[PDB]
Design a protein around this nucleic acid. Structure first.
Ligand SMILES: Nc1ccn([C@@H]2O[C@H](COP(=O)(O)OP(=O)(O)O)[C@@H](O)[C@H]2O)c(=O)n1
Ligand SMILES: [Cl-]
Ligand SMILES: [Mn+2]
Ligand SMILES: [Mn+2]
Ligand SMILES: [Mn+2]
Length: 534
RNA sequence: AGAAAUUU
RNA sequence: AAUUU
């Protein structure tokens, strides 16, 4: 029936200028050599993304769907939820949120400027009065950085972002924010993945795995998920929101937002022209993340039920899920995953890469990450979270006039501190750079480099400083990513580490603690590391 | 230059 | 600020 998009043919314009690297990258030309491989998805590529997401959806549901949907509404009934004062909603607006077409931006919104508040009052009135005139949206290409992959296309075309004006964004929050805080958790219980920390994720997966007599695992992801969301899906999303205790005033706002915005509408490029019309998810609305997650969850649990998946333990984050089940033998397991996929396709969530049964936790990737294992100080197995380092390294080398990648190095150092690639490569590079600059005592994205050992202890355990004997998978993949980006191989990073280390120790203070803890892997004379007050 | 979550 | 979807 429904096409996901129609296009006028008007271009998808830039929302400002898109910078390119320079002939010298002084911060990353000692990190890696192959800068030609590091690119940023551009709005020029958006046309290509559009061709790939424009297609015809033919959803076909069934008792398993209907049944899972029922039970989900019985959960929604436990939720009571409130409107949010116009002012509270204003102040959940992020600092840089794109300005309104109507002469005010996020400074005003956030500080409750009167011009902004009246406009928002009027917009909210109009949602209550008019429950049908479609609401215009702006469409734009997301600028992300990646490493080229000649196997998988060369250069990814840019993601499409579609969003209403700022006034509308605030009103969304008024109507729905509280729901976004109660509904998913209530509907999905422990399957709601965003509720967990990475440590909890890892523990959860191991618990699910240990619980089975004979575990089987797999993951799933929908191709161009936002395109695959049907008008009917979005209304079923509404109907699930409504199944809560709500003020009547919310119900009207919800229903109006659904009908005028969420279910579809016209699209304008940044230069103002009509660009096309939309009959699927607009990734840009408040309900993007909750919608996606709940909707993926319905289809997936129905699909599980269709396929025969036994004793499923699920974990869902948007369109990404992991199911750990009781295996029924591999011959049956393959058959059931094929069925799972057929069912998901019928429901309109067709697979990017068709899934496969797995019987080892390391081989299950989801949200671009997987669990892995190394040995700890005493020799116990220590399970942790990791990923292909290709992208983070690529982003580590993204230097332009406007952008510095140092903050990425730090963010990755913290999130993935226990990984061999963070420990040997990123840390080494990061510290090495700040020492030469003489900016160790500086603050980056409100974090003090010299705090890192503490920060890493609070978040990952003291084990993150002594881990050893990384897996074959992990070693292979790291080696292979460095070669792919023209980086030194790990042995060189060993050298650079020793040098940085001694150079850090000789400075004393917290710097020396950094040198001693973050780099104890780099020495044969390995010191006994004690917990840290801070 | 969209939203949310986690981390800080 | 970082990452993810
Ligand atoms: N930057 C992003 C990335 C994903 N998403 C949402 O999450 C969905 C699934 O993410 P994905 O990483 O599998 O990308 P798709 O190719 O499935 O669109 C997208 O279609 C978007 O609706 C988003 O809203 N903003
Ligand atoms: Cl141990
Ligand atoms: Mn997807
Ligand atoms: Mn309604
Ligand atoms: Mn995904």
């Amino acid at each position: 029936s429904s096409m996901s998009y129609s296009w006028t043919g008007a271009l998808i314009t830039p929302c400002g200028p898109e910078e390119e690297k320079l002939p010298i990258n002084p911060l990353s030309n000692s990190l890696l050599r192959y800068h030609n491989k590091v690119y940023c998805t551009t709005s020029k590529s958006a046309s290509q993304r559009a061709k790939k997401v424009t297609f015809d959806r033919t959803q076909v549901l069934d008792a398993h769907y209907d049944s899972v949907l029922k039970d989900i509404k019985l959960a929604a009934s436990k939720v009571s939820a409130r409107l949010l004062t116009l002012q509270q909603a204003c102040q959940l607006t992020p600092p840089h949120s794109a300005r309104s077409k109507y002469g005010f931006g996020a400074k005003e919104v956030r500080s409750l400027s009167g011009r902004a508040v009246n406009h928002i009052k009027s917009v909210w009135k109009d949602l209550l009065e008019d429950p049908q005139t479609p609401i215009p949206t702006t469409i734009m290409a997301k600028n992300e950085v990646f490493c080229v992959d000649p196997a998988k296309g060369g250069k990814k075309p840019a993601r499409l972002i579609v969003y209403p004006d700022l006034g509308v964004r605030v009103c969304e929050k008024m109507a729905l924010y509280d729901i976004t805080q109660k509904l998913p958790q209530a509907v999905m219980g422990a399957s709601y993945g965003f509720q967990y920390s990475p440590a909890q994720r890892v523990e959860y997966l191991l618990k699910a795995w240990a619980e089975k007599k004979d575990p089987m695992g797999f993951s799933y992801d929908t191709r161009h998920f936002d395109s695959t969301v049907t008008e009917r899906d979005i209304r079923t999303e509404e109907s699930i929101y409504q199944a809560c205790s709500l003020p009547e005033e919310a119900r009207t706002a919800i229903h109006s937002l659904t009908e005028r915005l969420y279910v579809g509408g016209p699209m304008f490029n940044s230069k103002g022209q009509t660009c096309g019309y939309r009959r699927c998810r607009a990734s840009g609305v408040l309900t993007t993340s909750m919608g996606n997650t709940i909707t993926c969850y319905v289809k997936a649990l129905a699909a599980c039920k269709a396929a025969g998946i036994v004793a499923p333990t699920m974990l869902v984050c948007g369109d990404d899920l992991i199911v750990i089940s009781e295996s029924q033998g591999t011959e049956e397991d393959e058959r059931n995953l094929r069925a799972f996929t057929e069912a998901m396709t019928r429901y309109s969530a067709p697979p990017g890469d068709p899934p496969r049964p797995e019987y080892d936790l390391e081989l299950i990737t989801s949200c671009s990450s997987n669990v892995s294992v190394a040995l700890g100080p005493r020799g116990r197995r220590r399970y942790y979270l990791t990923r292909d380092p290709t992208t983070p390294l690529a982003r580590a080398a993204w230097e332009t006039v406007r952008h510095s990648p140092i903050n990425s190095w730090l963010g990755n150092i913290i999130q993935y501190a226990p990984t061999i690639w963070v420990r040997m490569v990123l840390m080494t590079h990061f510290f090495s750079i700040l020492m030469v600059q003489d900016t160790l005592d500086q603050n980056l994205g409100g974090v003090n480099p010299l705090d890192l050992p503490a920060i890493i202890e609070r978040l990952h355990g003291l084990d993150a400083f002594s881990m050893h004997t990384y897996s074959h998978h992990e070693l292979t993949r790291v080696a292979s990513a460095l070669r792919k980006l023209g980086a030194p191989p790990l042995r060189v990073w060993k050298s650079r580490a020793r040098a940085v280390r001694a150079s850090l120790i000789s400075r004393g203070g917290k710097a020396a603690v950094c040198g001693r803890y973050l780099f104890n892997w780099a020495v044969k004379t390995k010191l006994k590391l004690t917990p840290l007050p801070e």
